[PDB]
Symmetry: C2
Subunit: 180 residues, 2 copies
């Protein structure tokens, strides 16, 4: 059921913070309805990247991605940027029409930078706006720090759980920070 | 007086949407206190770019920036990326310490992309987070559309006027879309 009011949540992992030097190594997406009810969980895909690219990762990235097991999944992966892009679009097309949903998540500005460069078609599937939960978090700690005590993220490596946590964060802000 | 709670608002103009192919042609900044009171407005600088660079602009861009007179300002400008970056930094350093303020404005995710590539020192001066007012506009439209009618923007070619309206918009949401 593709509804124009549905929201696309995304979360990527990368070899580094530089779009021109680094690459996407993992992608995960999920769709909620306008009211944040999770409707469908898309595929979590380790994006294959060469051994030379992986050798370029800085100290902290190599540690985090090797420790989570992502490095192994990336090497065993048979899906590069385009293949992972296509599967993600195939999933999204069934839940949200193109150009309708802003990109949703926490600090998704950095993620969109990589989409622009390596997954242009998926990037264009989003509405141009950004729906960054961290923006509300920033405003909450500046104008109502109280609410930040009532919600605490556990932290995880699993891409999807990370996203569900972003959805929960925004749902918290909707009830106790936003004035509906 | 630099205060760790002050917010840095910024608005750029570019020759196009592609950071690797386009360039910054205008930059304007403003600083507000934690409560959105404008403390100081920085310099509005047309950033010089070569005639060739300007020839790589698309139809929509060349038309918009030519009519506004920005193209003439660019050609005459004696301040390239670095020098415009230095001037912006001298201004900001007097009102906000480094790494404290997220980047603020409307859809500034796109602006930050250009700062990462052409003004990295300025980019690093911001806290890594984004304070995109358009994120609140998007939520208001989906959860409490009634308040939308009560706010309107004139539309202008003056960068500072755009930033002041962004500030006002956020102030509007703080009053009609946020709980004290």
């Amino acid at each position: 059921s593709a509804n124009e009011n549905n929201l696309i949540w995304i979360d990527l992992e990368m070899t580094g913070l530089d779009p021109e030097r680094d690459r996407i190594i993992e992608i995960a997406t999920l769709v909620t309805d306008a009211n944040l009810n999770i409707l469908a969980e898309g595929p979590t895909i380790a994006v294959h990247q060469s051994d030379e690219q992986l050798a370029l990762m800085d100290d902290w990235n190599v540690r985090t991605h090797t420790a989570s097991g992502l490095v192994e999944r990336v090497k065993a992966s048979t899906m590069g940027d385009r293949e992972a892009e296509l599967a993600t679009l195939e999933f999204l097309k069934q839940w949200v029409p193109a150009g309708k949903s802003p990109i949703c998540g926490n600090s998704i500005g950095q993620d969109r930078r990589f989409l622009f460069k390596y997954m242009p078609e998926l990037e264009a599937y989003f509405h141009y706006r950004y729906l960054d939960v961290s923006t509300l978090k920033e405003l909450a700690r500046r104008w109502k720090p109280e609410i930040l005590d009532g919600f605490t993220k556990q932290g995880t490596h699993q891409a999807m759980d990370d996203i569900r946590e972003s959805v929960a964060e925004l749902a918290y802000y909707r009830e106790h920070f936003i004035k509906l």
